[PDB]
Amino acid sequence: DKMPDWNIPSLYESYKNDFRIGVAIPAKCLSNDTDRRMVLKHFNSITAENEMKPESLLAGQTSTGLNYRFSTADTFVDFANTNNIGIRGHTLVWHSQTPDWFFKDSSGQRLTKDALLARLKQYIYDVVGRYKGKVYAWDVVNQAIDENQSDGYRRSTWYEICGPEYIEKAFIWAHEADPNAKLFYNDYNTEISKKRDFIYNMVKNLKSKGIPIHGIGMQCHINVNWPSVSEIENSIKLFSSIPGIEIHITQLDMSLYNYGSSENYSTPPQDLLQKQAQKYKELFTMLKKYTNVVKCVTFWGLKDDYSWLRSFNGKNDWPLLLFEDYSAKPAYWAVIEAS
């Protein structure tokens, strides 16, 4: 019952003078003819949804270092490179998406700070080096900020063993391994004022002291009720006040539900689909005011039944621009209208 329309306006072409338009996809899309054609019609950047995370690239360890499994990730990078589109690297440092043995030695022992930092250098050199010149942007560090901590830092194993030095060292080493990649700090809920302030100061201070961070990634996992487009704009205004910092919108999607709500729909309510469309229109009208700093906007999924949100919350959701049958949503037409 698939109903892709090959003749409607290309998303990225509609925004060609504003910013790249990207999509996160899983590996299965690369072997599906309909998915591939839809990706290349509408998007000029991709992100591997899961297949370039540390848990996906790491195969294990021995007495002398790390062992990798790159076959699937190679297919993503080759797909982008041979089809003249960019691929954003998701992600070098991300505690929850890293296996627990990574933080212990081959004898099952928890690593000292110096041993873990040495392992981090090895990982970054190996992964960024393999793809040197082929990944235009890396999310180097993801989700290091926790606004309920007094100093703002998430108390992950990275922080507990290394303190905050792991953040700046990850950027230094990534920039050594591929000097031409744009390097991002990536996070979510950047519209919570206290978190925004922690991120702003962290990145400002890194940049001041010469750390090669080039951008902030705002995930923008949002919903039809929160945050307001004005709040997203306030984040863009503050982050873009840092000289030399660009912005990518890295994982945009818009749940039809409030977070923590027990609503559960079998079919998408039309009034929420209209609220979604109007908010996507407002969002993109706002983003077009900041094309000097916002260089890429990536949607976290090709179509609604591919959304991570369905498994994550255990219910149907319709957060993206295409329906399950590949057909355009009101949201799609709103994004085209905003262009």
Ligand X SMILES: OC[C@H]1O[C@@H](O[C@H]2[C@H](O)[C@@H](O)[C@H](O[C@H]3[C@H](O)[C@@H](O)[C@H](O[C@H]4[C@H](O)[C@@H](O)[C@H](O[C@H]5[C@H](O)[C@@H](O)[C@H](O[C@H]6[C@H](O)[C@@H](O)[C@H](O)O[C@@H]6CO)O[C@@H]5CO)O[C@@H]4CO)O[C@@H]3CO)O[C@@H]2CO)[C@H](O)[C@@H](O)[C@@H]1O
Question: φ, ψ for residue 257 (rounded to 5)?
Answer: -105, 155
Token pair for residue 128? Answer: 């960024």
| Coil, strand or helix at 15 | coil
Of the pair 188, 336, the CB lying nearest ligand X is at: 188
Residue 123's Cβ-count burial label (10 Å; 0-12, 13-18, 19+) is buried
Q: Would you give the distance in Å from CA 302 to the centre of its chain? A: 14
Chain position carrying tokens 């991709």: 46
Distance CA 335, CA 15 (A): 10
Distance CA 88, CA 252 (A): 14
Of the pair 180, 311, the CB lying nearest ligand X is at: 311
Candidates 29-37, 76-84, 251-259, 286-294; binding stretch for ligand X (CB under 6 A): 251-259
Q: Which one of residues 12, 76, 136, 308 is an interface residue with ligand X (CB under 6 A)?
A: 308
* Half-sphere exposure of residue 214: CA atoms within 13 angstroms, side-chain side: 16
Q: Which one of residues 15, 79, 171, 188 is an interface residue with ligand X (CB under 6 A)?
A: 188
Give me the least distance between CB of 261 and ligand X, in Å please: 9
Candidates 153-161, 197-205, 220-228, 265-273; binding stretch for ligand X (CB under 6 A): 220-228
Binding to ligand X by residue 276, rule CB under 6 A?
Answer: no
Of the pair 44, 56, the CB lying nearest ligand X is at: 56
Candidates 13-21, 73-81, 108-116, 185-193; binding stretch for ligand X (CB under 6 A): 185-193
Size of the site for ligand X (CB under 6 A): 14
Question: According to DSSP H, which parts of 163-306 are helical?
Answer: 165-177, 193-208, 229-239, 270-287
Q: Which one of residues 18, 35, 49, 246 is an interface residue with ligand X (CB under 6 A)?
A: 49
Token pair for residue 251? Answer: 């994982």
Q: Which one of residues 27, 40, 161, 192 is an interface residue with ligand X (CB under 6 A)?
A: 192
Binding to ligand X by residue 47, rule CB under 6 A?
Answer: no
Q: Which one of residues 4, 8, 14, 50 is an interface residue with ligand X (CB under 6 A)?
A: 50
Torsion of CA 38, 41, 42, 47, to 10 degrees: 70
Give me the least distance between CB of 308 and ligand X, in Å please: 3
Chain breaks in the chain (C to N over 2.5 A) after: none
Binding to ligand X by residue 154, rule CB under 6 A?
Answer: no
Give me the least distance between CB of 327 and ligand X, in Å please: 23
Site for ligand X in 75-134 (CB under 6 A): none
Token pair for residue 43? Answer: 């998007």
Of the pair 243, 260, the CB lying nearest ligand X is at: 260
Binding to ligand X by residue 189, rule CB under 6 A?
Answer: yes
Q: Which one of residues 258, 271, 289, 337 is an interface residue with ligand X (CB under 6 A)?
A: 258
Distance CA 246, CA 92 (A): 19
Q: Which one of residues 45, 98, 235, 251 is an interface residue with ligand X (CB under 6 A)?
A: 251
Token pair for residue 135? Answer: 């990944």
Asked if 300 and 248 touch (Cβ cutoff 8 Å), the reply is: no
Residue type (1 letter), 201: N
Q: How far is CA 43 from CA 19, 75, 290, 297, in A?
A: 11, 17, 20, 10
Binding to ligand X by residue 142, rule CB under 6 A?
Answer: yes
Of the pair 223, 298, the CB lying nearest ligand X is at: 223
DSSP summary character for residue 31: G
Give me the least distance between CB of 64 and ligand X, in Å please: 30
Residues making contact with ligand X (CB under 6 A)? 49-50, 142, 188-189, 192, 219, 221, 223, 226, 251, 258-259, 308
